[PDB]
Design a binder for this molecule. Structure first.
Ligand SMILES: Nc1ncnc2c1ncn2[C@@H]1O[C@H](CSCC[C@H](N)C(=O)O)[C@@H](O)[C@H]1O
Length: 225
């Protein structure tokens, strides 16, 4: 999966120095980002996922490496309050909101989870992605279709793995994201193009990254109270 290196680089560029910070890792899966955030010096990391199966995995991972991550099974859109943190990290949370209403609830939960000087770092589907402009299979995500779903779009996809793992997500428009951000009470936000570097260009055949730059499936997003 060639895209994961760039995603990790972009996320940690947005996060910056985590030393001594408290961190809430939303849609945490098995804990990849929260666990690495801790490795780089975070004071405290809490992970939340809606899947009991994923949290069971995430807890076994922390047992294997002996790290102090704490995990919770919760639906972020309807989340029991969990305190306030210096940093909320949300890699692949918002594209699982199945309605604009649910996207807006998620941004409100995030804002309630933030200290006044805190920040949200998020990775999500670029609203401008258009399936016709090029698939993302060569970067690790095979987008199979694109269907209108209310004011947004539904995509069925699969990770280019063995076996290829199927999943489904939602692409909400930039205007709906920015409305959810503003109405949740974030005074500032910035979209972050993924940090494709000269080193990436040099280590791949010419033009390998053209579709990635012309029709990126991913985007970063940083919001501050
Ligand atoms: N409403 C919701 N609340 C919390 N977690 C959710 C959710 N909808 C989907 N998820 C979780 O979000 C995850 C997306 S996969 C991303 C996992 C991890 N952040 C990583 O980057 O590796 C899945 O584990 C899924 O269970």
């Amino acid at each position: 999966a060639a895209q994961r290196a760039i995603e990790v680089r972009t996320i940690f560029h947005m996060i910056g120095d985590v030393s001594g910070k408290s961190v809430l890792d939303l849609a945490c899966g098995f804990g990849f980002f929260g666990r690495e955030i801790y490795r780089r010096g975070a004071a405290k990391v809490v992970g939340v996922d809606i899947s009991e199966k994923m949290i069971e995995l995430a807890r076994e991972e922390s047992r294997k490496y002996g790290d102090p991550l704490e995990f919770h099974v919760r639906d972020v859109a309807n989340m029991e309050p969990l305190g306030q943190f210096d940093l909320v990290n949300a890699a692949w949370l918002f594209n699982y909101a199945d309605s604009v209403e649910n996207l807006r609830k998620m941004f409100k939960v995030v804002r309630a989870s933030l200290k006044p000087d805190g920040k949200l770092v998020a990775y999500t589907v670029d609203p401008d992605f258009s399936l016709a402009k090029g698939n993302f299979a060569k970067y690790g995500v095979n987008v199979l279709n694109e269907r209108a779903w209310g004011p947004g779009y539904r995509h069925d996809a699969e990770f280019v793995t063995d076996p290829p793992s199927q999943f489904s997500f939602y692409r909400w428009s930039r205007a709906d994201y920015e409305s959810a951000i503003a109405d949740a009470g974030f005074s500032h936000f910035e979209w972050q193009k993924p940090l494709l570097e000269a080193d990436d260009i040099a280590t791949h055949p010419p033009g390998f990254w053209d579709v990635f730059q012309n029709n990126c499936l991913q985007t970063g997003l940083v919001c501050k109270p």
